[PDB]
Amino acid sequence: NPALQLHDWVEYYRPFAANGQDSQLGICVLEPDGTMIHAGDWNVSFTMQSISKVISFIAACMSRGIPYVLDRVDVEPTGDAFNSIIRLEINKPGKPFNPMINAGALTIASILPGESAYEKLEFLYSVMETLIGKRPRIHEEVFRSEWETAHRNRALAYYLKETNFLEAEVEETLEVYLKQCAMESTTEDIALIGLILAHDGYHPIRHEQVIPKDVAKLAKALMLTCGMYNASGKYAAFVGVPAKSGVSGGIMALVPPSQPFQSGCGIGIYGPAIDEYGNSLTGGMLLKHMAQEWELSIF
Amino acid sequence: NPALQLHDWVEYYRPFAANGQDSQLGICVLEPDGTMIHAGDWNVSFTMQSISKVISFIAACMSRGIPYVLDRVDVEPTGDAFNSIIRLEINKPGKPFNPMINAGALTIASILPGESAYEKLEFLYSVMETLIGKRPRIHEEVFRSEWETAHRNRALAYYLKETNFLEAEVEETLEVYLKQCAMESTTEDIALIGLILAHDGYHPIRHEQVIPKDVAKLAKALMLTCGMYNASGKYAAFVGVPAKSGVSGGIMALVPPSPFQSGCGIGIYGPAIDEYGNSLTGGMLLKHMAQEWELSIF
Amino acid sequence: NPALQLHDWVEYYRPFAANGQDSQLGICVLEPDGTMIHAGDWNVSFTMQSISKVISFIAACMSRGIPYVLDRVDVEPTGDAFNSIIRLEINKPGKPFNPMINAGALTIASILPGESAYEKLEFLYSVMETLIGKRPRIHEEVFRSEWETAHRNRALAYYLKETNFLEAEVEETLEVYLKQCAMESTTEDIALIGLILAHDGYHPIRHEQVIPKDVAKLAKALMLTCGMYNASGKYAAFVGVPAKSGVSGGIMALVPPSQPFQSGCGIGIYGPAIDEYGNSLTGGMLLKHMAQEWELSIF
Amino acid sequence: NPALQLHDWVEYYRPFAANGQDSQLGICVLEPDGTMIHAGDWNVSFTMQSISKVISFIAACMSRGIPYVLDRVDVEPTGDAFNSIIRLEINKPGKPFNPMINAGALTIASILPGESAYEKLEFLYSVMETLIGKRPRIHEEVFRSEWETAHRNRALAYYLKETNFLEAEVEETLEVYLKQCAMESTTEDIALIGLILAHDGYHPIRHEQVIPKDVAKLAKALMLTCGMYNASGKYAAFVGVPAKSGVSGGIMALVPPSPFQSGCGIGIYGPAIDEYGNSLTGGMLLKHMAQEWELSIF
């Protein structure tokens, strides 16, 4: 059923990509026992974009410890856009609200262990490797294009610098931030990432505690609350499963233990066309429909 | 153990009420089988205040239907104070972000079924009655006091009226709104309301579907995302249990099925509240439970 | 010339009333020597609306003294709409920015001498009488309509109450505020009002110091800076003369002493159709054109 | 008397520099006939900082023309801090409100004529030269220091670039911007610049039209409405003279024709500045003059 059903909903939702800003749609669901299913363009490589924020938040937590990270960044939804800047001036002293939005993610990248973008990125990549099992390939072309026009982000970054919420130089931090966003991946890779988090940091395939439980838990908490930005409320209400998105069109979702996926799973969706919030338009229609039918809500 | 650990914990966190604006602290946990445990001021009656926004919301949905409510109110966190008015003007057209914040709940009040505040209130008291099993008692004194000085809320109400997000007269809506907030309850009552919700609307004591499953589910979603206002994030991250509070000191919380392996309802009372409007001691108490028994749904 | 010229520009600008939200346009310029000119619909009665704010600000200043008024209300432009409310919550303790916007004007009305709307309004009317020479007639119909739908204003009012910036009950204050806005008048009446202010509180016709110099000066200062709300910057730049507007379409302008109007004057314009800022669309095109040609700018 | 009253006043307000973040205070008033009076630290050189936004603005207008500048920047007060970024995001599309605030002046810098910061700077130094009568000297040390830590301003610049309100590269614009701010001057120089402006651009010492009348008029309008940022209101109400300040302590002001019956230029220096970025002592000094001699154009 699952397999058959995904093939149906993918083909049923593919068309709404004319309402976003493209007609590609892929999904991959993975279980702790290795069972894997997919439909659509699930093996097509795309940059993780904002999905990498979950990982860097993890890395920073593992290196510095949750306390150290919480001093620098909060965990509250902002109600604003992922790249909004107003709360950095308004809300004094100006601490970023959470690590999912651009501002907090920029802060996180700045507190990653290392003295240079390379040193920090090395630590991030190594962790990434403990998850997907290989080193992250990067999309130089995308990183280049992005490094040349990351205006909004440099503004955010520079503003954070001033209010002293950047444990590193601006351009240095941009590089870290822009590279992680350029880390290539497929629905298969992010699906496996969710499956690991779904099981509180335990890799069910490799039987090894790759991420500390409390950290993986904290990560999930933030996905639910800020993972989909100022659309998270909707996701919680109509999907009710931790999820994170990437402007490139990806969505990493996951279901914690306890008919279908009774043992939980990691979800990986790809849908280039994105909505006003920056979340995959059809990717979201596919995730909502799934959760709806199989009743995945953790509420 | 739970019964005992609760007594220890309450006695332990009671003294922290000195940091908020109060020395009381009470709890009550209820299970589907009927087992109930409590410690401290669990029987001291208190107004539900905002804890009622969840029932009025649930009621609007039962009457109007979810589709109708979602056209009048959204379900997004504002990242602002519960009584913040900012977004009613800045975010045009001006649809209130969610029913948990004062702006949304007022909108919700205006859409309840009825030609008057009385009619809208009776429908509310009835739903609230198929939950706690009795007509709710209203703290007349508290209401009269709030009625005279609910300025902030009146501004909110009036602004919503201006942006056409009130399907009722302002004063009529204030009435309905300030009335539910005044409804009286003890940890036992909200604990029950929380158990019913935890079980997707099935009342585990009368064995009956008292709330449309999808509606109860939606309420729980809102609780987790906005129930504790601009403090909800920390709550999902440090307690991880859907919760809802009232400035009177109440906290309603619940654990979905799978200690308390079959879910549960939580009722907490702690008059002293923090900067976000959530009970200080009550909040600490819920956190300890959450940590120690691992209730987090994450 | 002046007379002839006004008749021309009125007829040239009348048509642009199809771009506002009506085709009426009137003007009346008055000098200290009694010389008066007008064109268009200058003798048509309209409610002063926000123009009354200048008067109540005056009254309050005369009764309480500028210090007392300045404690309750500031004199800074807000950059927001005349009926905006955000700064009442954002900017703590939440003091209104100026007496020209709705919020500050509501505060002013609340500090007018009296215990009731009647007692306060009596004081305001009496002052109004010392200016126009008669008691203000009121447009009951407009006041009624307005009292039934002044939502935005009650919100403002009620919010001020909470932050304690209203020296009176909300509804009481609304009545005061809503009545002054309903005070009827013609271009002739407001023109004479400007002429008095133009001469620092001296009635040039009646030869009597009706308004204290420092108060009339303060009033002018605020017209220039906040009189046209978030359009005052434009007026200062393209008109450069103190001015106040009323949503009903009126504009009261004035030129202080030192070819045309060398001895100064008071200007009264009426143009029902108003722009996005709430300022008469054609009334403004007429005031700009005048200032431009005769070079009225005080800069 | 003026020469003397100035000495008394300066000596009198000097001591108030303890309340701001400095003990210096200097002034210089210049008339069309060439009479010049001064008291205190009037010859102590200081960077113009924001006082230069008026000349760069005047220059952009001379080169591009007013119509072109007004499509890139408005002339409205923001009611916010000079270095506030808020409106660049909230007020869409995001056109900076006015050239006096940091956001606008940066926009202005980007539109000056030129293919590089050097070319845009030379055009600026030339205009500034047909005013003070000499190539402006740049405080290299101060500039180098600001260049390394102008974060806030960099954020502003970068946001404008994002909303397409910069007709130049960010760093190139920062350069031009941080360079003019570093231009050196004494009360005498800004006083002169103020006299020229007071006379609608006619230089009363060389008898020549050095600034298009309409342009000089527009500059004076902006000075009165935004020159003192979110403190301009108080200034129109308590000084009533078009003024412009710099965080270095400078204040430029001027009185249009009809003491000083033929207008005048004012140059003030007072390092200690208030919460709005305007000189504390300098501000008090200008106010006293304004009151005592009745300079108010209102």
If you write DSSP's letter for every residue of C237-265 in order, what string do you get? HHT-S-EEE-TTSEEEEEE----TTTT-E
* Residue C93: exposure state from Cβ atoms within 10 A (0-12, 13-18, ≥19): exposed
- Residue C64 to residue C111: CA distance in whole angstroms: 8
Residue reference for tokens 């709409």: C81
Residue type (1 letter), A281: L
Q: CA of C76, closest CA in chain D: separation in Å?
A: 4
> Measuring CA to CA, how many Å separate D295 from each of C154, D12, D254?
40, 20, 9
> Given CA atoms C231, C234, C238, C241 in this order, what sign does their dihedral have?
positive
* Residue D258: exposure state from Cβ atoms within 10 A (0-12, 13-18, ≥19): exposed
| Residues C71 and C60 sit within 8 Å (Cβ to Cβ) | no
- Residue B167 to residue B205: CA distance in whole angstroms: 36
- Residue A143 to residue A38: CA distance in whole angstroms: 28
DSSP, res B137? P
Phi, psi (degrees; rounded to nearest 5) at C40: 75, -150
Mutation site, A225, A228, A232, interface B, largest B CB count within 10 A: A225
Coil, strand or helix at A280: strand
C-alpha torsion B253→B254→B259→B263, nearest 10: 170
| Residues D52 and D180 sit within 8 Å (Cβ to Cβ) | yes
At a CB cut-off of 8 Å and minimum separation 6, what does C161 contact?
Answer: B151, C170
- Residue B294 to residue C291: CA distance in whole angstroms: 74
Q: ∠ CA(D258), CA(D264), CA(D269), 5° rounding? A: 140
Q: Would D1-46+185-298 and D47-184 be classified into the same CATH topology?
A: no
Residues of B with CB under 8 A from a CB of C: 84-86, 89-90, 151-152, 154-159, 161-162, 170
Token pair belonging to A7: 């093939």
Coil, strand or helix at C96: coil
Phi-psi region of D38 (alpha: psi -120 to 50; beta: other; left: phi over 0): beta
- Positions at the binding site of A for substrate: 50, 102, 146, 153, 177, 229, 247
Q: ∠ CA(C35), CA(C41), CA(C46), 5° rounding? A: 100
* Cα atoms in the Cβ-side hemisphere of radius 13 Å centred on C162: 22
Contacts of D155 in chain A (CB under 8 A): 85, 154-159, 162
Long-range contacts from A33-40, C-beta under 8 angstroms, 24+ separation: A33/A204, A33/A263, A34/A205, A36/A188, A36/A191, A37/A2, A37/A3, A37/A6, A38/A6, A38/A187, A38/A188, A39/A3, A39/A6, A39/A7, A39/A10, A40/A6, A40/A7, A40/A10, A40/A11, A40/A14, A40/A270
Q: CA of C70, closest CA in chain B: separation in Å?
A: 24
| Residues D32 and D44 sit within 8 Å (Cβ to Cβ) | no
For domain D1-46+185-298, give the fold: Beta-lactamase (3.40.710)
Mutation site, D82, D162, D164, D166, interface A, largest A CB count within 10 A: D162
Concatenate the DSSP letters of all residues of A186-251 into one string: -HHHHHHHHHHHHTTTEETTTTEE-S-HHHHHHHHHHIIIIITSTTHHHHHHHT-S-EEE-TTSEE
Coil, strand or helix at D46: strand
- Residue D91 to residue D77: CA distance in whole angstroms: 13
DSSP, res A79? S
Chain B CA closest to residue C81: B89
Q: CA of B73, closest CA in chain A: separation in Å?
A: 12
Token pair belonging to A168: 């590193």
Residue type (1 letter), D177: Y
> Measuring CA to CA, how many Å separate B142 from each of B46, B100, B150, B173, B181?
10, 21, 12, 17, 9
| Residues B58 and B127 sit within 8 Å (Cβ to Cβ) | yes
Q: Are C89 and B90 inside 8 Å of each other by CB?
A: no
Contacts of D217 in chain C (CB under 8 A): 240, 297, 299
Q: Are A76 and B220 inside 8 Å of each other by CB?
A: no
Q: Are B80 and A76 inside 8 Å of each other by CB?
A: no
- Residue D189 to residue D48: CA distance in whole angstroms: 10
Quote the crossing angle between the two packed helices C151-162 and B151-162, to the nearest 10°. 160
C-alpha torsion A140→A141→A144→A149, nearest 10: -140
Q: Which helix (H) or strand (E) holds B209?
A: strand B208-209
Q: Does residue C297 have a known ligand-binding role? A: no
| Residues C233 and D76 sit within 8 Å (Cβ to Cβ) | yes
Domain C1-46+185-299 indexed as CATH 2.60.40.180: no
Contacts of B220 in chain A (CB under 8 A): 299
Token pair belonging to D62: 């001379």
Q: CA of B102, closest CA in chain A: separation in Å?
A: 16
Q: Are C77 and D80 inside 8 Å of each other by CB?
A: no
- Residue A47 to residue A28: CA distance in whole angstroms: 16
> Measuring CA to CA, how many Å separate D184 from each of A34, C229, D101, D128?
72, 36, 20, 11
Picking from D78, D226, D233, the nearest residue to C74 by CB comes out as: D233
Chain D CA closest to residue A90: D86
- Positions at the binding site of B: 50, 102, 146, 153, 177, 229, 247
Chain B CA closest to residue A79: B78
Residue reference for tokens 């262990």: A113
| Residues A147 and A175 sit within 8 Å (Cβ to Cβ) | yes
Q: How many CB atoms lie within 10 A of CB D163?
A: 18
The answer to whether D159 is a known catalytic residue is no
Q: How many CB atoms lie within 10 A of CB A12?
A: 14
Closest CA to A164 of A115, A95, A113: A95
Contacts of A74 in chain B (CB under 8 A): 233-234
Q: Are A218 and B237 inside 8 Å of each other by CB?
A: yes
Q: Are C87 and D79 inside 8 Å of each other by CB?
A: yes
Quote the distance between the C-alpha of residue C111 and its chain's center.
Answer: 18
The answer to whether B258 is a known catalytic residue is no
Phi, psi (degrees; rounded to nearest 5) at A183: -65, 120
Q: Are A233 and B296 inside 8 Å of each other by CB?
A: no
- Residue A125 to residue A136: CA distance in whole angstroms: 6
| Residues B252 and B283 sit within 8 Å (Cβ to Cβ) | no
Q: Are D232 and C77 inside 8 Å of each other by CB?
A: yes
> Given CA atoms B215, B216, B220, B222 in this order, what sign does their dihedral have?
positive
Closest CA to B128 of B78, B227, B39, B62: B62
Q: Are B155 and C158 inside 8 Å of each other by CB?
A: yes
Phi, psi (degrees; rounded to nearest 5) at B165: -120, 25
Residue reference for tokens 């939804």: A77
Q: How many CB atoms lie within 10 A of CB D92?
A: 9
DSSP, res B139? -
Experimental technique for the deposited model: X-ray
Q: Which of D13, D125, D159, D177 is catalytic?
A: D177
Q: CA of B71, closest CA in chain C: separation in Å?
A: 22
> Measuring CA to CA, how many Å separate C145 from each of B163, C4, C137?
18, 39, 17
C-alpha torsion B107→B112→B118→B121, nearest 10: -90
Quote the crossing angle between the two packed helices A213-222 and A52-64, to the nearest 10°. 140
Helix, strand, coil proportions of chain B in percent (round to 5)?
A: 50, 10, 35
Residue type (1 letter), A176: V
- Residue C77 to residue C232: CA distance in whole angstroms: 9
Q: Does residue C229 have a known ligand-binding role? A: yes
- Residue B250 to residue B279: CA distance in whole angstroms: 7
Residue reference for tokens 């040193």: A119
| Residues D30 and D255 sit within 8 Å (Cβ to Cβ) | no
Q: CA of A112, closest CA in chain D: separation in Å?
A: 21
Closest CA to C247 of C48, C85, C18, C106: C48
Long-range contacts from D164-168, C-beta under 8 angstroms, 24+ separation: D164/D93, D165/D72, D165/D73, D165/D88, D165/D94, D165/D95, D165/D96, D165/D107, D166/D106, D166/D107, D166/D110, D167/D72, D167/D110, D167/D111, D168/D109, D168/D110, D168/D111, D168/D120
| Residues A170 and A158 sit within 8 Å (Cβ to Cβ) | yes
Q: Are B158 and C170 inside 8 Å of each other by CB?
A: no
Q: Which helix (H) or strand (E) holds A147?
A: helix A140-149
The answer, yes or no, to whether the previous bond of B96 is cis (omega within 30 of 0) is: no
Q: Does residue D54 have a known ligand-binding role? A: no
C-alpha torsion C95→C98→C103→C105, nearest 10: 120
Contacts of D298 in chain C (CB under 8 A): 217, 220-221, 224, 242, 256, 298
Helices (H), chain D: 2-13, 53-64, 66-72, 86-90, 102-111, 117-132, 140-149, 151-162, 170-181, 187-198, 213-226, 232-238, 280-293
| Resolution of the structure in the document, Å | 2.6
Picking from C154, C159, C161, the nearest residue to B85 by CB comes out as: C159
Per residue in A238-272, is it b (16+ CB within 10 Å) or e — as a string?
Answer: bbbbbbbbbbbbbbbbbbbeeeebeebbbbbbbbb
CATH number of A47-184: 1.10.1500.10
| Residues D91 and D140 sit within 8 Å (Cβ to Cβ) | no
Each domain of chain D, given as residue ranges in start order, spans 1-46+185-298, 47-184
Concatenate the DSSP letters of all residues of A92-142 into one string: TT---S-SSSHHHHHHHHHHSSSSSHHHHHHHHHHHHHHHHSSPPPB-HHH
Residues of D with CB under 8 A from a CB of A: 84-86, 89-90, 151-152, 154-159, 161-162, 170
- Residue A51 to residue A53: CA distance in whole angstroms: 5
Q: Which helix (H) or strand (E) holds B194?
A: helix B187-198
- Residue C208 to residue C189: CA distance in whole angstroms: 17
Q: Which residues of A are catalytic?
A: 50, 53, 177, 229, 247
> Given CA atoms B77, B81, B85, B87 in this order, what sign does their dihedral have?
negative
Phi, psi (degrees; rounded to nearest 5) at D245: -125, 170
Contacts of A156 in chain D (CB under 8 A): 155
Q: CA of C168, closest CA in chain B: separation in Å?
A: 13
Mutation site, B224, B229, B258, interface A, largest A CB count within 10 A: B224
Q: Are A170 and D151 inside 8 Å of each other by CB?
A: yes
Q: How many CB atoms lie within 10 A of CB D292?
A: 11
Token pair belonging to D56: 């760069």
Q: Which residues of C are catalytic?
A: 50, 53, 177, 229, 247
How would you write A26-52 as a 3-class SS string? EEEEECCCCCEEEEECCCCCEECHHHH
Contacts of C75 in chain D (CB under 8 A): 233-234, 236-237
Q: Are B85 and C85 inside 8 Å of each other by CB?
A: yes
Q: CA of A200, closest CA in chain B: separation in Å?
A: 9
At a CB cut-off of 8 Å and minimum separation 6, what does B15 contact?
Answer: none
Token pair belonging to D7: 């000495």
C-alpha torsion D185→D188→D193→D196, nearest 10: -160
Which residues in chain C have their C atom more than 2.5 Å from the N of the next written residue, marking a break after them?
A: 21, 258
| Residues B60 and B128 sit within 8 Å (Cβ to Cβ) | no
- Residue D297 to residue C299: CA distance in whole angstroms: 8
Q: Does residue D76 have a known ligand-binding role? A: no
